[PDB]
Structures are given as C-alpha cells and as structure tokens.
Design a protein around this nucleic acid. Structure first.
Ligand SMILES: [K+]
Ligand SMILES: [Mg+2]
Ligand SMILES: [Mg+2]
Ligand SMILES: [Mg+2]
Ligand SMILES: [Mg+2]
Ligand SMILES: [Mg+2]
Ligand SMILES: [Mg+2]
Ligand SMILES: [Mg+2]
Ligand SMILES: [Mg+2]
Ligand SMILES: [Mg+2]
Ligand SMILES: [Mg+2]
Ligand SMILES: [Mg+2]
Ligand SMILES: [Mg+2]
Ligand SMILES: [Mg+2]
Ligand SMILES: [Mg+2]
Ligand SMILES: [Mg+2]
Ligand SMILES: [Mg+2]
Ligand SMILES: [Mg+2]
Ligand SMILES: [Mg+2]
Ligand SMILES: [Mg+2]
Ligand SMILES: [Mg+2]
Ligand SMILES: [Mg+2]
Ligand SMILES: [Mg+2]
Ligand SMILES: [Mg+2]
Ligand SMILES: [Mg+2]
Ligand SMILES: [Mg+2]
Ligand SMILES: [Mg+2]
Ligand SMILES: [Mg+2]
Ligand SMILES: [Mg+2]
Ligand SMILES: [Mg+2]
Ligand SMILES: [Mg+2]
Ligand SMILES: [Mg+2]
Ligand SMILES: [Mg+2]
Ligand SMILES: [Mg+2]
Ligand SMILES: [Mg+2]
Ligand SMILES: [Mg+2]
Ligand SMILES: [Mg+2]
Ligand SMILES: [Mg+2]
Ligand SMILES: [Mg+2]
Ligand SMILES: [Mg+2]
Ligand SMILES: [Mg+2]
Ligand SMILES: [Mg+2]
Ligand SMILES: [Mg+2]
Ligand SMILES: [Mg+2]
Ligand SMILES: [Mg+2]
Ligand SMILES: [Mg+2]
Ligand SMILES: [Mg+2]
Ligand SMILES: [Mg+2]
Ligand SMILES: [Mg+2]
Ligand SMILES: [Mg+2]
Ligand SMILES: [Mg+2]
Ligand SMILES: [Mg+2]
Ligand SMILES: [Mg+2]
Ligand SMILES: [Mg+2]
Ligand SMILES: [Mg+2]
Ligand SMILES: [Mg+2]
Ligand SMILES: [Mg+2]
Ligand SMILES: [Zn+2]
Lengths: 71, 119, 84, 101, 50
RNA sequence: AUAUUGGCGAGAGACCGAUAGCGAACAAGUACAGUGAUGGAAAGAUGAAAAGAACUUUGAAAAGAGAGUGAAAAAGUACGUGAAAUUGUUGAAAGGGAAGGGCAUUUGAUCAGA
RNA sequence: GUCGAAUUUGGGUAUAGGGGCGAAAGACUAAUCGAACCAUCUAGUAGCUGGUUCCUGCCGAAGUUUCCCUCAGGAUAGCAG
RNA sequence: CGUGGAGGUCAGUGACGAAGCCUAGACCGUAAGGUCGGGUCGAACGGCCUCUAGUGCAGAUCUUGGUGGUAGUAGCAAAUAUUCAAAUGAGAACUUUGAAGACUGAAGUGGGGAAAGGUUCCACGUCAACAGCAGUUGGACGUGGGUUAGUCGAUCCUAAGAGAUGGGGAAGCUCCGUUUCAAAGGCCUGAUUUUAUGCAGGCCACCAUCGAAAGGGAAUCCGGUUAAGAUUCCGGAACCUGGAUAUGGAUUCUUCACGGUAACGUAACUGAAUGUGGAGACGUCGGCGCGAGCCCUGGGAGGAGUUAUCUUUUCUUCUUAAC
RNA sequence: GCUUGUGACGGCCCGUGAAAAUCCACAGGAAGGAAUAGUUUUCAUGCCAGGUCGUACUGAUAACCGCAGCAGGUCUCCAAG
RNA sequence: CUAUCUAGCGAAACCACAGCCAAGGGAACGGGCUUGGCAGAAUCAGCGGGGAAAGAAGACCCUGUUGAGCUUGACUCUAGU
RNA sequence: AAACUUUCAACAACGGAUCUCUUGGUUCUCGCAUCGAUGAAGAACGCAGCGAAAUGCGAUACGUAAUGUGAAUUGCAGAAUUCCGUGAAUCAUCGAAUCUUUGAACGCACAUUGCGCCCCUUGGUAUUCCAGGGGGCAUGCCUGUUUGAGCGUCAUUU
C-alpha cells in the first residue's frame, strides 16, 4: 500500500463493508479535501474492505498521506 | 478522563454535534496513530466519549419528542411503555373494574359485612 | 464400483447453509431446511427428537431480551429513573 | 408385493409426455359468431412437422373479427392442403378440402 | 471455487481470522485452566463443511 | 383447595464423588462424524505462595550435571498420592522337550518368641 | 466387448421407502436392499445361549407320577431344607 | 468376614504424620479376614453397639481404559534413474546451485479452467509434532503480505421444473392448482393547472415470483508492471448503456432529402396508438470451397553451435491487438 | 497437411432437432411542424456517470472425494518434428 | 523386483496354559493323563504334516408354540369399484 | 561358566488405579408467574491496546446512560492515585438508550450481501437520469374514515 501511495498516487484505505464506491469517493473528498480520480474496491480475505483511491493528478497522495499522519 | 454526561447535558444540540464531530476526527487520527504506535489504549476513551455524546444527543431528542407528544394519546410506540406484550394487551384498570348497573346496585346494597363471633 | 471409485463423484452439495439456522441443512432442490424447517413459519422439532430440542431450544443462545425480562419483572416493569 | 408399472404410470413423474418441441395444441377456431352464421377466410402459412405426431400441422391465419390483428390457429393438415391456400370455416363455407363445416 | 458467494467468502474470512494459536498472554492469567486452542482447524485435517 | 422432569428465585438430602453423578464438575451439546435427519466424546488435583529453577558447566540443540527455591523437586506445569498389567538395571536363585502345585525333609537366606 | 447413436458424459431438474426406479438381476435407491437411512415406541418379547461377585458349619436331592398346542417348557405329586 | 453411608459411644487415632500404596518381615483366625513392624505419603480416619444399601468378581466373544508376547517381526519391492561437485548446516542419499544422465513426448508428468477445497497462493522465520527413511526442505509450524473490473462472470431472460396469490380440500401440520369460477391495471394525457390531479376526455391485460458462473445476453484490447493481482493495476487506444445537451452538418419557398430503369445508394433525411415481420433461434453426418493459427520452406538482415574432415551448414529473432 | 472458424451443398428420420428476455424494421398516419426564419439528439463533435458481489491458488500418483500426502474416482479447452 | 543381510521406520492376525513322540484308556483321533521311548543353552533360512491353526455365536439339518420375502377361494379383513 | 528364561526384592519406568479432595450432578421441598409485530426464541457476522474460545456486547459493539458502593483493574501495557471525590471498578444495581444482518420476519426475492416503488432532502443544469442521507411500501381480520360498484333496490325530477 505504501508503494502504491508513493508511486501510483493511490491512497489505500480500509473502508466499511457497507460503503460503495460513491460513498468512498465522497468520504475521501470530504475528509481530506482531495479530488478522487477513481476508486477500486476489493473484499480482503479477512472480511474487511480495501479501497484503492486514485486521486486526480492535481494532488499528490504522498503529501496527503503525510498530512493525515502516515508517511 | 473522557467526557461526562452531566457536563454534556448542559450543552445545546449544536455544541453536542460539534463535539461529536471533533471526537470522530480525534478517533480517526488515533487509529491512524495506532498503526505505528503499539498498544495505544487512548482510543478506548475516545470511543466511550463518542458513545456518551451520542447517548446525550439521543436523550435530548427523545425528551423533545416526549414533550411534543405530552398528554395526547397515540405516542410513538418506542416512547410508549414497554411492559410485556401480554401486559400491554391486558385490560386497563378502568376496564375489568367496569361493572353493570345491576351489579353496582346489588354490591352497594349487600357488601361483605364485618362481623365477629363474641359468644 | 459403489465404494471407493464411486465416492470420487461426490462434488455436488445436496444441502447448503440455511438462512434461519446456519446448519448447512437447507436442501438446495427442495428449498427446505432439514433441521429447522425453513422456510416454514414454525421451527421444525419433534418429541421423538428430545436431544435435538435440547440442542436448539431457548437458552442455547444468548437470549438477548429474555435474559432481562426476569429482572424487569422483579422490579415490576418500572419506567422512570433511579432519582439519585 | 410391489406397485406394478402400469400403476406407477398414473403418478406421471417420468411418464409425462415429452412436449417441448411440439407446436401447440391442434384445435379448430373457437366457435364464434362468424362461424356460427357465415364463414371466415384464413390463409395457410405453414405446413409443419409436429414432434411426437404423425400428421403434419397447418398454421392458418385468420383476421380477428373484433380487433385489428391476426389470429394464428394450429389445425391438423388434411391431405391436399397447401400453403397459401384459403381455408373457409363456418356454416356457409364451401364443400372444399380443408374447409371447416 | 474461485466463483464463490459472499456468504461462503464471509465464513471463509471468519475461519481465517480464528485460525490462530492461543494468545500467549493467556496462560499468564490468575487461574487460567486454558492450555491451548482446542478448536484449531486446518484445511488438511478437518473440512469446514461450508 | 388440585397439577407442574419447563421458566425464575430459594432451602435441603442416611443421594453420586470424575469409568460415579446429567451427555457435559473443564472454552459440552463443545471437538469430531454424517449429504441429511441426526450421532456425539475425552478431558478436574504442583505448591501456602511460582518461590515456575538466577548462575556455572557439557551439548548445535533438546536436554544433562551442578547450583538454587521450596516443608517436600520421593511436588519441575510430561506436576497430589502414584496400584497392577508390562519394562529396564542391580542383587539372589534355579533351569537336559513347558512352568506352576501337594506332603515331607536337606541346604541356603531370613525371622519372632522365652 | 464396443467404439457415430438404443453412444458417452457434465450441470439443472423430477420420481422417496411397501414408496420410487427397473431393456427385469429382486437389480438399484449415498460401501445399506427379498423393503434405505435417522430418532422414538424400546431396557420390545425370548420356554433359547452366556454370565451371575465373601467364608465356614449342618442337612441334602431329581431326571419319576398325572395333566398341558407338551416332547429344550410348565403345573402337579414325589425326593430336600 | 469384608465395603459405601447413618444414629450412639470410645471426651478413640492423627501434620511429633490420618487415609492410600509397597513390603519370599512378625502375630492371630479352619477361613472370609484381622493385627503389627519397615518404606512411601500427606489430611483425614477408626474400634464397639445398632441402622442402611447402588455392599464383595475370574470368567459374561462382559464395559471403559491401560499393557503385552507375537516383534525389532510382516514389511516400507507398481508408475525405467539416478550420479558428481560446491554451498548451507551440528548433522545432507533426499535442501539449494551448477554439471551430467533420463523421463513425461502436445489424447503430457505442459499451460488453463468447471465442481470441490479455503489460504493450501507469496515472503520471512523456522523443525517439537506431521511428510510410514531422512530432512537444513514442505501443501508442516510461527508471523505477516496478497485477490483492484461500466466492458470477465453473477446480476437479467426463460428451459425441464419449483412455487405464492384468487379459490377449493384437509381435524391439522398443510395439500391442490399457476391463469385458474378474481372487481387481480398502470402509462398516457384533453383539460385541471381552487394541484398537471381527484372528479374528469380518450389507448392497451387471460397475470407473482424462483429456475442456467456450459443455454440466450449491451459493451476492451495491446504493451508493461508484482514476492504473490491483472482482459481488473499503469500507459496508450477503444467501445456500450443511461442521461444531459450545444454547435456544425442535413432538411424546409414544392415543408418532413435527393440519386439509380432497377437491384438498391447515402452523413443525416419527422412519425403516436395499433398491427405485422425479422433477428435472438438452434439436429447430425459427408465430401467440396475459403479464411485464421500452426506445420513445412526460399532469399535476406542479426545472434548462437559444429568445424581432424564435410556441411553457402544446424538452431534461433524477423511480431502487429481490440477498435 | 493439422487444429479451428465458415460458406454453398448433399444424405438421414413414423427422430425434422428449446424458450424467453432483448433489439431492430416495416405498415399506419395521430400529432407536430418554416420564412429579420422554423425542423432535425437513427449524421458528426462535444459533457457526465456506470453501483453491488466474485477474482489468490490447486484442480489432483499431495490442495476435491475415497478415515491418508490412498496405483481408485472426478467435467472440459489448447496441442510442435 | 522380492525374499535375504544391513541403517532407519515399524504394524496385525492370534494367544486358557503351552508346545517331542508311540501305545493305552479317555467325550470312542492327547501337548498335558498312564506306561514306555527319550531328553542339553541360544538360534537362522525355508517349509507347509500337525496345532481336529486363523477368519465368522454353521448359511446345510433339526428345534422354537422366533420372523420375514413371495403365493393361493387358507383364516380374518380392507382401499377401490 | 555366561548369555537367555523364570521368580522375588530395591530403585527407576509404563500407566493412571487407590486414597483424600469437589464452584458439578441428582432427588425432595418451598415460593413466584414474567417471551414475541414496541419484533421473541434461534441464527450469521462483527466488537477489546495486546483474544482463538467461553462469557458479554452491537458500528454508542467485553459496552453508553442512570443509580448505589467508595478506590480499584491486573497477565502485560497504559492510565490514575483530585482519588476528603458527581468518583476507580472485567464491581453491584439497572428504570434511559444503542441494538449490524437476520429470524414468526413484513416491498419483491434470497445457493444473489440480487431487484424495485413512494415521500422528504442533498449534490451532479435535473419532476423524469445518476448518486448520498432520512422516512416508508407483507398478509388475514375487526372498528371506524374516505372513494366507489351493482336495473339488488327506494324516493324525487322525469
Ligand atoms: K425378507
Ligand atoms: Mg470488484
Ligand atoms: Mg449400494
Ligand atoms: Mg439433487
Ligand atoms: Mg462423567
Ligand atoms: Mg491426577
Ligand atoms: Mg512429601
Ligand atoms: Mg505424581
Ligand atoms: Mg509391576
Ligand atoms: Mg431369482
Ligand atoms: Mg434386561
Ligand atoms: Mg449327609
Ligand atoms: Mg389343548
Ligand atoms: Mg440346553
Ligand atoms: Mg453408596
Ligand atoms: Mg501413614
Ligand atoms: Mg509382592
Ligand atoms: Mg494437602
Ligand atoms: Mg452392584
Ligand atoms: Mg477383572
Ligand atoms: Mg465365576
Ligand atoms: Mg474379553
Ligand atoms: Mg479392551
Ligand atoms: Mg523385514
Ligand atoms: Mg510388497
Ligand atoms: Mg519404481
Ligand atoms: Mg539438482
Ligand atoms: Mg514411454
Ligand atoms: Mg521419451
Ligand atoms: Mg508455497
Ligand atoms: Mg519419517
Ligand atoms: Mg525426523
Ligand atoms: Mg503457513
Ligand atoms: Mg459480459
Ligand atoms: Mg403449492
Ligand atoms: Mg432468475
Ligand atoms: Mg452463458
Ligand atoms: Mg497469477
Ligand atoms: Mg486502464
Ligand atoms: Mg442529402
Ligand atoms: Mg474439436
Ligand atoms: Mg487467477
Ligand atoms: Mg490457476
Ligand atoms: Mg492441470
Ligand atoms: Mg483428502
Ligand atoms: Mg501321540
Ligand atoms: Mg482307542
Ligand atoms: Mg492340544
Ligand atoms: Mg512320562
Ligand atoms: Mg532343548
Ligand atoms: Mg508357507
Ligand atoms: Mg499345518
Ligand atoms: Mg449356533
Ligand atoms: Mg448364526
Ligand atoms: Mg413346543
Ligand atoms: Mg410371518
Ligand atoms: Mg433487534
Ligand atoms: Zn434451518
């Protein structure tokens, strides 16, 4: 996930199993003041949901991660 | 030491909603921290504070609705008394004390008397 | 055949998980749980199956409302607050 | 001591007719006013094989007398009936092969 | 089956999460008659039967 | 007034004492078996207190030998006691196709009584 | 043996126990079939087989009579305490 | 005679050691048994008078558990087959690498999938148990990482069939039946716009739903990328559906296009109800034609092999997706 | 030549070898329509969105079933000289 | 390729106690008993005479006032008609 | 004579009997009457700083609120020791709440975390399309309301 943040401009989140791509996109936008280019989701083998949130080219996911507290 | 319900109860619903939002932000940043820091028990306090603020908000909302529905029949079912289902189906005190005019007359005329044997 | 070679052809489940009891007794083709009788309204049980009744009866779960009904009766189904 | 085969046939589990490929029930037109009093002309569109049946069927299209539409009927083809032939059904239809009288 | 229903995947997730040895700080508790995970499952020994 | 192998709360016993007593004294209707209906165990005890063996030494290690704790390690979590079957070592004895036994005495060993 | 059609086979589906299904062997119906499996009635009944747990002391048999749907059993008399 | 429990009693025994257990040591009794010494042990137990019973085991192909001889025995012999060296390691027939020899020989011992499994995938650590030898290795053990879709599936459709409702049967659990003896209807709009609805104009109904990860079906490809994901990620390039929509184009002065004899053509080129038609949509075998990929092969531009001799030679790259 | 796709045909049947969703077209002519201008999202370009669940791996002489790491059984695609 | 021997690994059947004969008698075919013959540790590979070897409460036969499958103008009934 | 076999003893094994324990069972007696559409019993899945279970709980998730007590919890970590206090606690009590997905289970389905419809509201020009938030839509039956149907039928106009 850290490689994805640094290289692919993609924030990796654990999200609610009830949340869909629209809810994930609007929640990321609201919580982090960031435009979202795309959301991919999978259900992990441990029963949680993982969202790859690719941000638009305007924002740098590495600095977004730095701001929200994980480098 | 976490929030106290008696301190929250003196606050308006706007202040309580704001405090809930801040507590949610704090919990989010705390679970971010937990990923690096091992054994971070401080998140339990914020979780209980969020629970307490939600409890007080719901208390205020439900009290306002009780005030809205005071006195009139047909309260909302989750504000009505939850006795058992059979107890809510049972006859009220007015019913089951209803008596016919004939029965009222005859039991007024001949009640059980108080009498002792004195030899 | 009929023994080891025929046991190799066992890859189609006659029963899957039952929505009501979760036992993997929901017959796929009959659409009926062989354990709890779902989707019948009544829960399947029999007096010849005393052990099964014991397995699935009240108290085998957490009882989640009924575990407090008794205390509420003891206190007379009160409705207010404890009033410090 | 066992239920015999002719007894088992009545339950109709594996003894039902294999009707998947069949064209439909072979019937005359519903006996209506037009056939009760005059005649109605339809046209033979197809003479087709029916699965499980020896005799071929004729799909005869009549006009609906009460609604603007066509009514297809599945007749059993009589010998000599051909496609494009006008079939006449009713009290007043002519004594011709394929007519319903 | 690699084309599985969510119900099956959810039971699989629960099984994966509970497929672990006993937490070793248990066995330090005051009375603790618990010695080991007696409900440990393994794919080679006992089938989940869904 | 009568019933009550269910529920809730109590008091008891010439009852059972872990192969007993409910199947279940324990994470028991659990683990596990069966497609399924169903079937369904085993499993309690260091010590007052972990004081659960610091440290040295041999060993790759497991462990051993010491040291030590403890009233006790002939209590070391493979833990109260620790039978028998069966087994090792030591000691004694006998033994040409079984062994064991009865009566009697020799021999060896051992022992009470006055 | 057979191997291009009364062919082989997957999946779906239907038929359930005196019931099904059978190109018919009483075959098959989940290693179960001349009546599946599960639980209960049920600790079913058994004139039949096996077993039936301490010591010493005293006494001490019968396999015969009659009757029985009786002949591996019982009642009855006899023998015994 | 002995055992579990009970009333009474011996103000019985006992942490200075109860019970239990072991003991070719002693004593008493014909015996059932009783008593003592020694060792072990650790918390209770006994004599007598009575009470009571789930009260005495060698057997029951007895029940549960444990243990033998057999016995270091039978055996660990199908699937052609292994060998050398180095590394690692305490330890190597079995691990890793290299070298060699072989096999599967494309109806594979290859590459993928369906059912099923469920993390077995991958990495790191790691060998007590398991891998019927071994093990440093593993589908094991311990800790983690990992499955990214508008276009691939499910989702939708109906198939054999399953199955509510309306009704009928049945004491009843429930059974029949699936469009039937039912008052089973929403989607359109003149007007209403006291509000796009109710009244109020008018058009269509012999009917739930479930049933296919191989049937039908809207639409995505190539290259690259990971320890482990890829038609899903990245780059580029498309497409379909639903919607919103403004320009350009087209059309109209003969309003809803022109051309061609025609088959038909096109950048467009109004079209409600209703009806009709087509596609979806279909067996199997045979030969023939054509395409694609593969096979074979010539020249040429590269790389590799053999070269005592011969071989302008042997092997290999030369590709082009959806749209 | 092999694999496969396909076309036009031919043989066979007392066998003539699904259904529905869905899409299109036609018939019709309701209605709506132009001249300091009306019409046309079946022509071109342009804008937005496309949710949910599955997706790893094995698929077998060791990942399924057969008590197991069992010479058994278990559907299918590709296929060089 | 086994068997064989070795390193490692390591079961099971079965087992009253056991294991040399001849005759005798005996429940009429003894490993034990009687009378004789005899008889010397511990063993390995084979072997199939014996252990009336093992496997299974004989499936044949009989008995039981034990069944079941099937049949029939057995007795007694019954759905249907 | 060893080895070997057998018997006994001691020590050591194997094994778990015996003895003594007992928060368990069993039986008897006494008292009480309280599940559920205000969604029960049961199920699935989650929730803790470090838990797989048991137990508890439900996205307010080993719990929130209220009350009482009065200083803990404890395996570690952390916090705290104001703790002369509206205040510790895995405490007790419990009247207020929360109560995922379900389940008689209720919009339609369910081998699908599948598919609708209505209302309010928010965003994307947006009554119509998409999305987010909130609230709803089962059946039978009863009383009542409203809107209706039938030449079943009364009266009036006619
Ligand atoms: K029989
Ligand atoms: Mg996805
Ligand atoms: Mg069979
Ligand atoms: Mg089936
Ligand atoms: Mg027990
Ligand atoms: Mg013990
Ligand atoms: Mg001691
Ligand atoms: Mg011990
Ligand atoms: Mg012994
Ligand atoms: Mg025969
Ligand atoms: Mg008996
Ligand atoms: Mg005498
Ligand atoms: Mg008689
Ligand atoms: Mg006899
Ligand atoms: Mg007793
Ligand atoms: Mg003692
Ligand atoms: Mg002895
Ligand atoms: Mg003690
Ligand atoms: Mg007894
Ligand atoms: Mg015994
Ligand atoms: Mg005996
Ligand atoms: Mg025995
Ligand atoms: Mg045994
Ligand atoms: Mg051997
Ligand atoms: Mg062999
Ligand atoms: Mg071989
Ligand atoms: Mg190699
Ligand atoms: Mg070969
Ligand atoms: Mg070869
Ligand atoms: Mg691996
Ligand atoms: Mg091994
Ligand atoms: Mg080993
Ligand atoms: Mg692992
Ligand atoms: Mg598709
Ligand atoms: Mg039905
Ligand atoms: Mg469907
Ligand atoms: Mg398909
Ligand atoms: Mg892959
Ligand atoms: Mg892309
Ligand atoms: Mg033009
Ligand atoms: Mg082919
Ligand atoms: Mg894959
Ligand atoms: Mg694969
Ligand atoms: Mg393969
Ligand atoms: Mg297996
Ligand atoms: Mg002899
Ligand atoms: Mg003789
Ligand atoms: Mg003998
Ligand atoms: Mg002799
Ligand atoms: Mg000898
Ligand atoms: Mg032999
Ligand atoms: Mg022999
Ligand atoms: Mg016999
Ligand atoms: Mg027999
Ligand atoms: Mg008789
Ligand atoms: Mg009979
Ligand atoms: Mg609830
Ligand atoms: Zn169920």
């Amino acid at each position: 996930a850290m490689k994805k943040v640094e290289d692919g401009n993609i924030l990796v989140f654990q999200v609610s199993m009830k949340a869909n791509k629209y809810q994930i996109k609007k929640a990321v936008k609201e919580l982090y003041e960031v435009d979202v280019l795309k959301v991919n989701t999978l259900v992990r083998p441990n029963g949680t949901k993982k969202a790859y949130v690719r941000l638009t080219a305007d924002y740098d996911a590495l600095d977004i991660a730095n701001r929200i507290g994980y480098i | 030491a976490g929030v106290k319900a008696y301190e929250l109860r003196t606050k308006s619903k706007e202040q309580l909603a704001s405090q809930l939002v801040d507590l949610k932000k704090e919990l989010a940043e705390l679970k971010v921290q937990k990923l690096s820091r091992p054994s971070l028990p401080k998140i339990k306090t914020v979780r209980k504070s969020i629970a307490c603020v939600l409890t007080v908000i719901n208390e205020q909302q439900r009290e306002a609705v009780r005030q809205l529905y005071k006195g009139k029949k047909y309260q909302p079912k989750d504000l009505r008394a939850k006795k058992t289902r059979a107890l809510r189906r049972a006859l009220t005190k007015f019913e089951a004390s209803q008596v016919t005019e004939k029965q009222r007359k005859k039991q007024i005329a001949f009640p059980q008397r108080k009498y002792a044997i004195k030899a | 055949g009929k023994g080891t070679p025929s046991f190799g052809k066992r890859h189609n489940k006659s029963h899957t998980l039952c929505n009501r009891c979760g036992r993997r007794s929901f017959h796929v083709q009959k659409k009926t749980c062989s354990s709890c009788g779902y989707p019948a309204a009544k829960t399947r049980s029999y007096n010849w199956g005393a052990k099964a009744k014991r397995r699935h009866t009240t108290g085998t779960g957490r009882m989640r409302y009924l575990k407090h009904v008794s205390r509420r009766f003891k206190n007379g189904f009160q409705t207010g607050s404890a009033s410090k | 001591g066992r239920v015999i085969r002719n007894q088992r046939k009545g339950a109709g589990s594996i003894f039902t007719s294999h009707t998947r490929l069949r064209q439909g029930a072979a019937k005359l037109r519903t006996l209506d006013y037009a056939e009760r009093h005059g005649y109605i002309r339809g046209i033979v569109k197809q003479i087709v094989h029916d699965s499980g049946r020896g005799a071929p069927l004729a799909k005869v299209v009549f006009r609906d007398p009460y609604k603007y539409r066509l009514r297809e009927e599945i007749f059993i083809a009589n010998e000599g009936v051909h496609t494009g032939q006008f079939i006449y059904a009713g009290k007043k239809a002519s004594l011709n092969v394929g007519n319903v009288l | 089956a690699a084309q599985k229903s969510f119900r099956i995947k959810q039971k699989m997730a629960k099984a994966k999460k509970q497929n672990r040895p006993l937490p070793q700080w248990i066995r330090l508790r005051t009375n603790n008659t618990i010695r080991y995970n007696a409900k440990r499952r393994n794919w080679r020994r006992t089938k989940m039967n869904i």
